[PDB]
Structure 1
Amino acid sequence: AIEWYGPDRPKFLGPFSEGDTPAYLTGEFPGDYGWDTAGLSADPETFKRYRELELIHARWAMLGALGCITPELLAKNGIPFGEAVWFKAGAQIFAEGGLNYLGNENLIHAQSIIATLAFQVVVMGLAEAYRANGGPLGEGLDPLHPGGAFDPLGLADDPDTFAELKVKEIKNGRLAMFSMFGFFVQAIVTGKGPIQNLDDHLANPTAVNAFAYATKFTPSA
């Protein structure tokens, strides 16, 4: 069981996964568990673009799953900055003094969403287009894992643990995408923060769960 590659590997149905795992999923990629029940990635070009899209979704979801928990995690310590939930965090731009980073007034404290939006558009278009094509740190390399200045700490060498950390990255990333979809729907249905949902679940699990909010979206008409 100590492998994430080869023909025999950990799979998404466990011991129920011999009749699954078709011929074009061979375990040659980080995170192959034989889950292609829909059959979306038969073509290896389609499979390559889906793997790239999945891994950049993994990176942005690992960024997001921590950036949504840290405002409520510093509201746990008692640092007050406007609002601690993530899905009502943008409106602090439109506050009486603007969105503050850590609440201390000598910090970022920007007020106009349109100017920082334009700055985000230009530098993120430049950075992501350098990610797709190439720029001043590496022109033609892997579209998945460039390295170079992306590994200043030297974890890209010794390629077996590079593959092992690739599987670790895609596993934590898939857990982060699952967590971020759960964050989205806990924001939609409950309307409170996810750490607040954790406090309400730890305070009373048996009556306050998702089935408590099961009758919310019932169409009355």
Structure 2
Amino acid sequence: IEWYGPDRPKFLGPFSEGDTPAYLTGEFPGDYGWDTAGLSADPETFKRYRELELIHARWAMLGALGCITPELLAKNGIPFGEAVWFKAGAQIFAEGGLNYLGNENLIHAQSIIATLAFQVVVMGLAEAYRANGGPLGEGLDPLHPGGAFDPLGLADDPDTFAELKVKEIKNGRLAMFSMFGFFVQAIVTGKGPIQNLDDHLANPTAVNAFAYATKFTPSA
């Protein structure tokens, strides 16, 4: 396995020698040669799309872990006023507000407006620093800055850097796919991901997505 160069692993495997565009050189992590739509023919649009892909990847990984953790901890025994992720936002309108791990004296948030104000102010600060630098950086890479974002120092060797880049972008594509699944099957099922897995393990041939297939038929 290479992950780079001309004979890298590709998205159709053995079927992939004639489809790859000429601009998808095996230079960037996760380059399986999948640009059937030609949306990255321009190197600059390609760079912007690579940045979008990696940021969506990292945010989707954090979000996948954030949707899996509270439900696991919920059956693990921990009280969670609303453990399911797609109503974990409605805890602010409960009587005791959003208590972090069920403890009344951990956070105890009662206002969503101030939470959102907090969040917007420092998300804007952090994302602007991500754009053009700031207190942790000012001329680093827009995608792999390092320095203060490597307190452990995993990627000082270029080969380790490259393989961890591929690992990053692929765990991130996996998490993005799983987050799209979270979205669509929360809308279709209305239950959490962990409960969906529990129901699929209870009856795999009956409780699958096709049991909810006639749900969105107009019928008028």
Range class of TM-score, shorter chain: over 0.9
Once the two structures are TM-superposed, the CA of residue 196 in structure 1 deviates from its matched residue by 0.5
Cα deviations by residue, 1:172-193 (Å, 9 ceiling, x for unpaired): 0000000000000011111111
Aligned partners of 2:188 and 2:212 also within 8 Å: yes
- SS of residue paired to 1:75: helix
- 1:132 and 1:5 map into 2 onto residues whose CA distance is 28
- 1:205 and 1:134 map into 2 onto residues whose CA distance is 50
- SS of residue paired to 2:87: coil
Q: Give me the identity figure in percent.
A: 100
Aligned partners of 2:136 and 2:148 also within 8 Å: yes
Once the two structures are TM-superposed, the CA of residue 154 in structure 1 deviates from its matched residue by 1.0
Once the two structures are TM-superposed, the CA of residue 19 in structure 1 deviates from its matched residue by 1.2
Once the two structures are TM-superposed, the CA of residue 109 in structure 1 deviates from its matched residue by 1.1
Matched length: 220
Cα deviations by residue, 1:102-128 (Å, 9 ceiling, x for unpaired): 001111111100001101110000000
Cα deviations by residue, 1:55-94 (Å, 9 ceiling, x for unpaired): 0000000000100001111012121121111001111110
Cα deviations by residue, 1:4-48 (Å, 9 ceiling, x for unpaired): 100110000010001111100011000000000111000000000
Which residue is equivalent to 2:162? 163
Once the two structures are TM-superposed, the CA of residue 156 in structure 1 deviates from its matched residue by 2.2
- 1:58 and 1:197 map into 2 onto residues whose CA distance is 23
- SS of residue paired to 1:148: coil
- SS of residue paired to 2:9: coil
- 1:140 and 1:132 map into 2 onto residues whose CA distance is 10
- 2:3 and 2:155 map into 1 onto residues whose CA distance is 18
Which residue is equivalent to 1:43? 42
- 1:204 and 1:137 map into 2 onto residues whose CA distance is 51
- SS of residue paired to 1:151: coil
Moved more, 44-53 or 135-144: 135-144
- 1:69 and 1:76 map into 2 onto residues whose CA distance is 12
- 2:143 and 2:13 map into 1 onto residues whose CA distance is 28
Structure 1 residue runs of 4 or more that deviate by more than 3 Å after TM superposition: none
- SS of residue paired to 1:15: helix
- 1:41 and 1:88 map into 2 onto residues whose CA distance is 37
Once the two structures are TM-superposed, the CA of residue 141 in structure 1 deviates from its matched residue by 1.3
Once the two structures are TM-superposed, the CA of residue 144 in structure 1 deviates from its matched residue by 0.7
Which residue is equivalent to 1:204? 203
Which residue is equivalent to 1:115? 114
Aligned partners of 2:155 and 2:164 also within 8 Å: no
What TM-score, normalized by structure 2, do the two folds share?
0.99
CA-atom RMSD, angstroms? 0.7
Aligned partners of 2:96 and 2:104 also within 8 Å: no
Which residue is equivalent to 1:143? 142
- 1:39 and 1:160 map into 2 onto residues whose CA distance is 29
- 2:191 and 2:138 map into 1 onto residues whose CA distance is 45
- 2:172 and 2:181 map into 1 onto residues whose CA distance is 14
Unpaired segments ≥5 residues, structure 2: none
- 1:136 and 1:190 map into 2 onto residues whose CA distance is 44
